[PDB]
């Protein structure tokens, strides 16, 4: 049957005479304690609460403890993986290697749910259970770490490193709970500090509840479930779409931009509304959120390479013939898997790949959302700035012809939109160089100089895409001119259609409209040719790169022999590198259009005004 310490030497691991605290599976059993206690207290509270509208608030250290518990879940998955991996040699199953870590994983998820239900109901006096749990878990993990150090367990064995990480994480979560005690004094202080939920959350009519939901609900967009399920029932109107939160409003973003502009105008007075001043004002207004999006994007770019690396490790392990795994280090009759042979197992590399993709794609979507939200806030602030300039400009410059209604109209329509779309693609500006450089370096280390040749050919996609995009844009410009002429003729024909019916003058007008249509088709043929060239290059350059890198590796260079691990890791690296290389040209064109748009907006804001 199942034994906690295992049935070895007539169950000699259950012998405790040498010292109860230095017996390895007793402190491993002591570890189980706090998790069982936490489940015992927290389950009836959650189950009772699971059997209106609350306008929840957030405790201090909310984001910090969500991040800490995500890291804790990752480390506990690693603990379960190494515990299962380290008893694959003994005949008896040692439950104490992974079952305490599994109950720790369940207790961590339970702690997150229990904290969420405490935080929503705003009853911080139930955080005593979390405080006791973090205290007990930290104490038992410290006992495990200290006994490991007393039994000559070093950093060569992974379990020591993981339990040290567990000690640090439990201490950090305990510090977070004590900080919740300190800020909101729900215990030991005579009067607790009452905190009201945010005023925009209490507004019945604010339904973009992204800044107010928890960190997991921010990353997974779980608040959209009710909105989309309701949208299936009934169509979305301007009422089902709520009101903007105060953080994202045109008045708020405009006032923030005005504060930034005043701070810039105090410094340099030669040109307070030049392109440099506007760029520095935009940086001062939205730079923290821009670098937050860039941080998420860079972390996603680095974690995306866990795909090819775990593929390389998995296929390298599966390509090993007659593999006989047996961990060399054994302490107290209990095997310990080292870090080198931990990451050499295909199953744990698959699990780490699953977790790495789960974190990485969430980070990528978070970067996308933050960039989009700041672009929209910038668009609102810039439109308010342009309209405030409209209220003061003299009509004499409107009379002189240097401005028209159409110029300001397209300054809002396409120029503000171009600046907004640049702020959409702004983290790409340094994300794509980082991802491309790290991908080429990993290609060199995985495959060799043949991967450098293939990477050069796949890097050649960006200049040819830039050239084809330029030709495509000018072809559609010619198409736009001919289409405007055709719409002019069609509008005149449709308005004079009564007279045309009277005089039977249709087909003669059809001939002219079709002549303009034929010339537009001659332009559109070149437009479609360049579109086809773009599509063919995008879908054929990776094939050519893969072909040349593998054929040159096996034929020209005659390097180390091709293996499925290196070949498929390189193929995954090319599949990762193709998309940023394709969108790099679009990002560069967006940056150039942003520079032109900011210059045009500066020339509008630096114009004549009526006197006060």
């Amino acid at each position: 049957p199942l034994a906690f310490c295992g049935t070895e030497n007539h169950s000699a691991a259950y012998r405790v005479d040498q010292g109860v605290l230095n017996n390895g599976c007793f402190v491993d059993a002591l570890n189980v304690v706090p998790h069982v206690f936490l489940l015992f207290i927290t389950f009836p509270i959650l189950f009772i609460g699971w059997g209106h509208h609350s306008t929840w608030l957030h405790f201090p250290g909310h984001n910090l403890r969500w991040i800490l518990t995500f890291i804790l879940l990752f480390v506990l998955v690693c603990e379960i993986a190494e515990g299962i991996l380290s008893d694959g040699v003994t005949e008896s199953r040692h439950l104490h290697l992974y079952m305490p870590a599994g109950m720790a994983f369940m207790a961590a998820i339970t702690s997150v749910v229990y904290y969420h239900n405490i935080e929503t109901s705003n009853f911080p006096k139930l955080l005593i259970a979390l405080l006791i749990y973090w205290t007990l878990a930290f104490i038992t993990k410290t006992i495990k770490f200290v006994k490991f150090y007393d039994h000559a367990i070093g950093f060569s064995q992974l379990r020591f490193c993981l339990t040290g990480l567990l000690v640090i994480l439990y201490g950090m979560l305990l510090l977070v709970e004590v900080n919740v005690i300190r800020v909101r004094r729900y215990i030991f202080f005579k009067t607790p500090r009452k905190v009201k939920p945010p005023e925009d959350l209490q507004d019945l009519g604010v339904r973009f509840l992204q800044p107010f939901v928890n960190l997991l609900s921010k990353g997974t967009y779980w608040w959209m479930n009710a909105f989309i399920k309701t949208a299936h029932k009934k169509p979305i109107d301007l009422r089902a779409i709520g009101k903007l939160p105060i953080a994202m409003r045109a008045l708020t973003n405009y006032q923030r931009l005005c504060v930034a502009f005043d701070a810039q105008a105090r410094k340099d007075t030669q040109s307070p509304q030049g392109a440099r001043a506007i760029w520095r004002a935009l940086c001062h207004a939205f730079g923290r959120r821009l670098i937050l999006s860039s941080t998420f994007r860079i972390l996603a770019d680095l974690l995306g390479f866990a795909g090819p690396l775990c593929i390389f490790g998995i296929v390298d392990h599966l390509g090993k013939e007659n593999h006989v795994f047996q961990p060399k280090t054994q302490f107290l009759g209990v095997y310990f898997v080292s870090s080198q042979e931990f990451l050499g197992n295909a199953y744990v590399l698959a699990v780490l790949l699953f977790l790495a993709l789960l974190l990485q794609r969430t980070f990528l979507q978070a970067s996308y959302y933050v960039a989009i939200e700041t672009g929209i806030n910038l668009r609102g602030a810039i439109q308010t700035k342009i309209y405030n300039k409209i209220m003061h400009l003299s009509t004499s410059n409107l009379s002189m012809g240097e401005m028209t209604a159409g110029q300001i109209c397209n300054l809002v329509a396409i120029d503000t939109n171009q600046l907004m779309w640049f702020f959409f693609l702004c983290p790409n500006l340094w994300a794509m160089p980082v991802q491309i450089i790290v991908g080429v370096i990993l290609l060199y280390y995985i495959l060799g100089v043949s991967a450098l040749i293939g990477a050069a050919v796949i890097i050649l996609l960006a200049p040819v895409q830039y050239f084809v995009a330029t030709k495509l844009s000018q072809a559609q410009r010619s198409t736009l001119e001919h289409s405007n002429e055709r719409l002019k003729q069609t509008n005149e024909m449709l308005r004079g259609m009564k007279l045309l019916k009277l005089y039977a003058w249709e087909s003669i007008f059809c001939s002219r409209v079709e002549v303009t249509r034929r010339k537009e088709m001659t332009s559109l043929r070149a437009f479609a040719v360049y579109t086809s060239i773009s599509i063919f290059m995008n879908t054929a350059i990776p094939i050519a790169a893969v072909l040349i890198t593998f054929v040159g590796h096996v034929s020209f260079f005659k390097e180390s022999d091709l293996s499925p691990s290196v070949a498929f890791a390189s193929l995954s690296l090319f599949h990762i590198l193709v998309t940023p290389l394709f969108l790099l040209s679009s990002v560069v064109r967006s940056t150039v259009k942003a520079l032109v748009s900011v210059q045009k907006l500066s020339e509008f804001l630096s114009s004549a005004e009526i006197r006060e």
Partner: protein, 282 residues
């Protein structure tokens, strides 16, 4: 509500039928054959690497070169074919619309607004001429790539189909709910963009009258309301997009976990080669 959530199957059928049997048949054949050739390229890479693991290497290199060249040629063929199809459909459809509008009675012009007739020739013709070819190519290529990838990862691991069925059901529900929500949000976004630009035009061409009435603050508040409506429409649309993308990436994470675990189990002690699990992983 039923017509709102309904995909325009008849419109797509008429759009594709205007291309002709020869061109549409060539398009379908080229797309299917090109994706089969790509699958053949990656499968031959797997067999090539298995042969090098056990180790006619020049024969393997020649076959890989032939397959890659065929794939490049077929990529050129399908790009040229889809753009040609778009051009031909655009030309025929505009000619037919112009002739039928010309033959219409004068009562149709008297009763129906000019905007309804002209918006076709202006916006819908522009969409059919330029956006529909590229969107059709992208949808066809993405659908065929997804189907071929699911077929490959089900070929290396036949047990993946058992987990593929519930993931397919969940993905279908996700995409249906996203499609209805996203259609409503996109239409609302454009309809909120329109009065903001109209307000800008109206304020510019009537600025002296506005400032004479001391109505600057009221018009600024009107602009704030308009751009707040546009901003909240844009924010809900991008939130729906991120919802869909997070769900699809989590489905892909489950797919790669199941494929990895089953392929590792089949490769360790069920005589599956390392190249095939690497193929399924990519």
């Amino acid at each position: 509500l039923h017509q709102r959530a309904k995909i325009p199957w008849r419109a797509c059928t008429k759009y594709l039928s205007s291309a002709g049997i020869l061109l549409l048949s060539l398009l379908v054949f080229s797309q299917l054959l090109k994706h089969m050739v790509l699958v053949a390229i990656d499968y031959w890479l797997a067999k090539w690497t298995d042969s090098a693991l056990v180790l006619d290497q020049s024969v393997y290199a020649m076959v890989f070169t032939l397959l890659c060249s065929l794939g490049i040629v077929l990529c050129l063929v399908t790009s040229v074919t889809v753009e040609w199809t778009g051009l031909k459909v655009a030309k025929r459809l505009h000619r037919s619309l112009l002739n039928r509008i010309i033959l219409a009675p004068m009562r149709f012009f008297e009763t129906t607004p000019l905007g309804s007739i002209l918006n076709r020739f202006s916006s819908d013709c522009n969409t059919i001429d330029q956006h529909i070819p590229s969107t059709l190519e992208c949808l066809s290529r993405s659908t065929l790539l997804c189907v071929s990838a699911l077929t490959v990862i089900s070929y290396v691991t036949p047990v993946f189909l058992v987990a593929l069925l519930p993931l397919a059901v969940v993905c279908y529900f996700i995409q249906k709910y996203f499609r209805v929500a996203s259609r409503d949000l996109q239409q609302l976004d454009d309809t909120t963009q329109l009065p903001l630009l109209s307000h800008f035009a109206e304020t510019v061409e009537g600025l002296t009258t506005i400032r004479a009435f001391r109505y600057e603050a009221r018009f600024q508040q009107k602009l704030l309301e308009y751009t707040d409506s546009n901003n909240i429409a844009s924010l809900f649309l991008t939130a729906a997009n991120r919802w869909l993308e997070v769900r699809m990436e989590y489905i892909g994470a489950c797919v790669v976990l199941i494929a990895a675990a089953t392929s590792i189990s089949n490769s360790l002690h069920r005589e599956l080669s390392a190249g095939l699990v690497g193929l399924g992983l990519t």
